[PDB]
Amino acid sequence: TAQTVTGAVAAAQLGATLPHEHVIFGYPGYAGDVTLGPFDHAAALASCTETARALLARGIQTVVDATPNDCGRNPAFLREVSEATGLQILCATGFYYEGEGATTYFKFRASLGDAESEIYEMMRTEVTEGIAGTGIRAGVIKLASSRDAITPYEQLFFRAAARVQRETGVPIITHTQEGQQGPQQAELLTSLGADPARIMIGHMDGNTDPAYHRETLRHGVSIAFDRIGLQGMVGTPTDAERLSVLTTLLGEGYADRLLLSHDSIWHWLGRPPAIPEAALPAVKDWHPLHISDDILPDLRRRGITEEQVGQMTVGNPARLFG
Numbered sequence: 289t290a291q292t293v294t295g296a297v298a299a300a301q302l303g304a305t306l307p308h309e310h311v312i313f314g315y316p317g318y319a320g321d322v323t324l325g326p327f328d329h330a331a332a333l334a335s336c337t338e339t340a341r342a343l344l345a346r347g348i349q350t351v352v353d354a355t356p357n358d359c360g361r362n363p364a365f366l367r368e369v370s371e372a373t374g375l376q377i378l379c380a381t382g383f384y385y386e387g388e389g390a391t392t393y394f395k396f397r398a399s400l401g402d403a404e405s406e407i408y409e410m411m412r413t414e415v416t417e418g419i420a421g422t423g424i425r426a427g428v429i430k431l432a433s434s435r436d437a438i439t440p441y442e443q444l445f446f447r448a449a450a451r452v453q454r455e456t457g458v459p460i461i462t463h464t465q466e467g468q469q470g471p472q473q474a475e476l477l478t479s480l481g482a483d484p485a486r487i488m489i490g491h492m493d494g495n496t497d498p499a500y501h502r503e504t505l506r507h508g509v510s511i512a513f514d515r516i517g518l519q520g521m522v523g524t525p526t527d528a529e530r531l532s533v534l535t536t537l538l539g540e541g542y543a544d545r546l547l548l549s550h551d552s553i554w555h556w557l558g559r560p561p562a563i564p565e566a567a568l569p570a571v572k573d574w575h576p577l578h579i580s581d582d583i584l585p586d587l588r589r590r591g592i593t594e595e596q597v598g599q600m601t602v603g604n605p606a607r608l609f610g
């Protein structure tokens with residue numbers, strides 16, 4: 289059974305799922321801008337609950353919140369949103385990648401002792417017991433790596449997660465930076481004994497060469513085109529490019545291993561971002577209703593079957609997280 293912020297749910301009750309989104313999110317440092325960028329709890333709850341209701345209207349029953357521990361993760365808030373709407377939400381345990389995470393703390397611990405073991409204890413505790421003493425458990429482990437390599441800092445997390453995976457069976461979802469390291473992540477995790485059927489390599493839509501995806505898929509892991517809607521936003525390709533690669537893969541029979549999400553942020557922590565003019569088109573379709581309203585219908589018109597769409601949105605999530 290999957291562990292959600294309101295308790296365990298049977299694989300069968302997960303339904304259509306968005307495997308990677310962010311109810312709330314803040315880049316590391318946002319907490320230091322608390323005076324002019326405070327969290328308006330009432331406003332966030334209202335906004336997030338309306339977004340949640342809109343997903344329910346689309347038949348989406350579950351969302352996997354992939355927010356790292358150092359990026360504004362708030363299991364208690366996720367629980368309020370879930371209790372107020374009925375939307376099921378899984379939260380994560382893990383730290384962001386070296387280039388953008390709050391890395392000083394664990395680099396410090398690592399200099400004094402066994403950081404891998406401490407990260408392992410944190411992950412195991414949050415998965416099996418609860419987070420911050422709330423009784424709310426993490427339903428997934430979030431791992432993330434840099435573009436040019438899975439750094440030594442990042443590896444600490446990959447190794448701790450592999451062990452927690454082996455001991456608990458918990459799912460693992462990841463972040464790949466700028467369309468690279470997908471194969472390395474799959475290889476590393478599987479060589480450490482992690483169950484390939486419970487691993488989702490993320491941001492794979494970030495690379496538009498299908499050879500890169502097939503190689504990653506050779507490891508038996510699943511891969512997610514989880515930033516659908518974010519187009520040409522520094523690196524990120526266009527949705528047209530994503531769909532081209534996605535239909536090529538579906539035609540090669542990979543439906544059992546493909547997942548789809550937006551990586552949307554429902555409410556920002558810190559001061560809300562003001563998107564400049566030149567960037568409006570890049571974020572226009574970057575919201576959690578995009579796949580349901582635009583992408584799936586477009587796949588169907590391209591020849592993709594209802595069975596294939598259901599495999600990606602309901603089948604795979606049930607197997608991976610349930």
Ligand SMILES: C[As](C)(=O)[O-]
Pocket residue numbers: 355356359384463551
């Ligand atoms: C890579 As992220 C925490 O902005 O989704």
Ligand SMILES: [Co+2]
Pocket residue numbers: 462463464491
């Ligand atoms: Co990410």
Ligand SMILES: [Co+2]
Pocket residue numbers: 308309310354355551
């Ligand atoms: Co994300």
Ligand SMILES: [Mg+2]
Pocket residue numbers: 317319390
């Ligand atoms: Mg800090």
Ligand SMILES: [Mg+2]
Pocket residue numbers: 453454481482483
């Ligand atoms: Mg295993």
Ligand SMILES: [Mg+2]
Pocket residue numbers: 483485486
């Ligand atoms: Mg299994």
Ligand SMILES: [Mg+2]
Pocket residue numbers: 581582583585586
């Ligand atoms: Mg359309």
Ligand SMILES: [Mg+2]
Pocket residue numbers: none
């Ligand atoms: Mg059209």
Ligand SMILES: [Mg+2]
Pocket residue numbers: 586589590
């Ligand atoms: Mg078309």
Ligand SMILES: [Mg+2]
Pocket residue numbers: 591592593594
């Ligand atoms: Mg058909």
